[PDB]
Amino acid sequence: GSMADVPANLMEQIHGLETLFTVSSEKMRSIVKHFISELDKGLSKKGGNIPMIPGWVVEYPTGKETGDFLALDLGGTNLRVVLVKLGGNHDFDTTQNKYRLPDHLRTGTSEQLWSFIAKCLKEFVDEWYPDGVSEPLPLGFTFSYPASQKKINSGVLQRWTKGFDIEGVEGHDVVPMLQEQIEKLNIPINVVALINDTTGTLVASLYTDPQTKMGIIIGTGVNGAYYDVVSGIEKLEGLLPEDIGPDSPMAINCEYGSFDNEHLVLPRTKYDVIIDEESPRPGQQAFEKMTSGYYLGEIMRLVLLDLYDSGFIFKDQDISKLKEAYVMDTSYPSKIEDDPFENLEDTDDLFKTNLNIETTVVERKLIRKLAELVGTRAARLTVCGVSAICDKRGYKTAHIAADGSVFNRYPGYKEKAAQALKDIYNWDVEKMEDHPIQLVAAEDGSGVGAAIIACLTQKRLAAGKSVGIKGE
């Protein structure tokens, strides 16, 4: 609440940061206008900055999908392998194992990555099918990075995101890279489909919630998927086989973490500039860099180090541990917003124990305000992607299936995101559950969604129907 004890000199800095990080309802509406134009440009013949990548899911799941499938999920804190049993009445069951990523995987080689993944797949298959199998197990591969797909079992990596920086993969088809390592270990796996995590979120959540119109991730990254219609995808004109007609649905992985790399509308601050310049891929993922869980603690770190350098805080402290980029992950602002003490004892312990920095009560109130500003900005900017897709497609109502560490775990985040949509549309509604466009907990898109997409894909191929451009 209250700040009576904070000197005027520091209150001026807090007021400057509030100004710098606050996004007005009108600013969200103007961002949304420009976001719609950039979504449409990405579907155009000439293309645009936002990839808008077709995912070759050309139908809705009916709920009657049946059978056992493997899902391989690259992009959680761990690698995950899942055995998914579809039940045939909108029901499923799963069991899974998680595998710790090698140290420095993100800056390692392609060969390291594909060898580690195949090793984990063989461990899983040996554990769950110790007696072997009569036919190759069908697998859906969730690759949580932007990949061009000429057909559903191909994925050519466009750019590493979220800190990744593995040489030899951007511009390469990852499905053959995975397949060669599967073969080398003689694992009986049929890679039926590659999907993005948003596309899986969309499809898995539609299997149990028929009002789903988007699948979004608000986690280590930020992105969304939805279904367009083939007639609305100009860049597919002349490329489609005859069985996929103009009225067919087509799921789109927007990769809208990329939005506004031109820096024409988002309220980038000097802290966002540094994050982008110091990241592995400068010039890329502008919207995600402002919003997602890989970055929110790094925005706080850079603000704190500016306030120190300018003489305002930590004046008598050794701040050496604060100089390490990414040392403050989003668990810092999360714990700070959760601290239930008046004088922020939990925050005191966090800075002393983990950073060796003694704080005053007034400095912890400043830090708490900073965490709140950064989280609120993230929520208000992130729902502009939802508003943009819904306005573009003419959805006045929607369940928006959401997943990811920030939506699920960041204190207060679901309430702020729902308030930001309420503010965009000027609804009168009182309770979150009554919002006409509302975020709801998703089904597991990287596990259950990859399995349903593998199932739908196999059914198409058994029927002789297409799952890629003509000549694929």
Ligand X SMILES: OC[C@H]1O[C@H](O)[C@H](O)[C@@H](O)[C@@H]1O
By CB under 5 A, name the binding residues for Cl ion: 7, 9-10, 53, 269-270, 395-397
161 binds ligand X (CB under 6 A): yes
Structure tokens at 277: 């310049």
The answer to whether 255 contacts ligand X (rule: CB under 6 A) is yes
Site map 388..427 versus ligand X, x via CB under 6 A: ----------------------------------------
Q: Which does 145 bind (CB under 5 to 8 A by kind): ligand X, Cl ion, none?
A: ligand X
218 vs 233, beta carbon nearer Cl ion: 233
Whole-angstrom Cα distance, residue 421 to residue 28?
9
Does position 142 interact with ligand X (CB under 6 A)? The reply is no
Per CB under 6 A, does 444 bind ligand X? no
Under the binding rule (CB under 6 A), the answer on residue 284 touching ligand X is no
**CB atoms inside a 10 Å sphere around CB 289:** 27
Structure tokens at 393: 């497609």
Burial class (CB in 10 A: 0-12, 13-18, 19+), 344: buried
- Residue 279 in contact with ligand X, rule: CB under 6 A: no
Q: Alpha-carbon distance 297 to 257, whole Å?
A: 18
Contact segment (CB under 6 A) with ligand X among 196-204, 232-240, 343-351, 455-463 equals 196-204
Of the listed pieces 82-90, 97-105, 219-227, 375-383, which binds ligand X according to CB under 6 A? 219-227
- Residue 45 marked as a ligand binder: no
Is 382 among the residues that bind ligand X (CB under 6 A)?
no
196: partner contacted, choices Cl ion, ligand X, none (Cβ within 5-8 A by kind)? ligand X
Among the listed ranges 131-139, 181-189, 212-220, 266-274, the one in contact with ligand X (CB under 6 A) is: 212-220
Q: Which is nearer to ligand X, 215 or 333 (CB)?
A: 215
Q: Report the partner that residue 221 touches, choosing among Cl ion, ligand X, none (CB closer than 5 to 8 A by kind).
A: ligand X
Q: Pick one of 69, 141, 145, 227: the residue that binds ligand X (CB under 6 A).
A: 145
Closest CA to 179 of 120, 101, 118: 118
Where does residue 464 rank: exposed (0-12), middle (13-18), buried (19+ CB within 10 A)?
A: exposed
385 binds ligand X (CB under 6 A): no
Closer to ligand X at the Cβ: 212 or 220? 220
Contact window for ligand X (CB under 6 A) among 139-147, 271-279, 311-319, 434-442:
139-147
Do the beta carbons of residue 70 and residue 138 sit within 8 Å?
A: yes
Nearest partner of 403 among 76, 40, 8, judged by Cα: 76
Name which of Cl ion, ligand X, none residue 288 binds, using a CB cut-off of 5 to 8 Å depending on partner kind. Answer: ligand X
Closest contact distance (angstroms) between CB of 437 and ligand X is 20
Query: According to the binding rule CB under 6 A, does residue 181 interact with ligand X?
Result: no
Partner touching 138 among ligand X, Cl ion, none, CB below 5 to 8 Å by kind:
none
Kindly give the pairing relationship between strand 222-229 and strand 189-195.
unpaired
Among ligand X, Cl ion, none, partner that 189 touches (CB below 5 to 8 angstroms by kind): none
Instruction: Decide if residue 146 touches ligand X (CB under 6 A).
Output: yes
Report the catalytic residues. 144, 159, 197
Interaction with ligand X in 53-82: which residues (CB under 6 A)? 75
Q: Which stretch binds ligand X (CB under 6 A): 18-26, 217-225, 387-395, 428-436?
A: 217-225
Query: CA 253, CA 227: separation in Å to the nearest integer?
Result: 9
Q: Pick out the residues of the known binding site.
A: 98
User: Where on the chain is the footprint of ligand X (CB under 6 A)?
Assistant: 75, 144-146, 161-162, 196-198, 217, 219-223, 255, 257, 288
Q: Pick out the residues of the known binding site for ATP.
A: 98
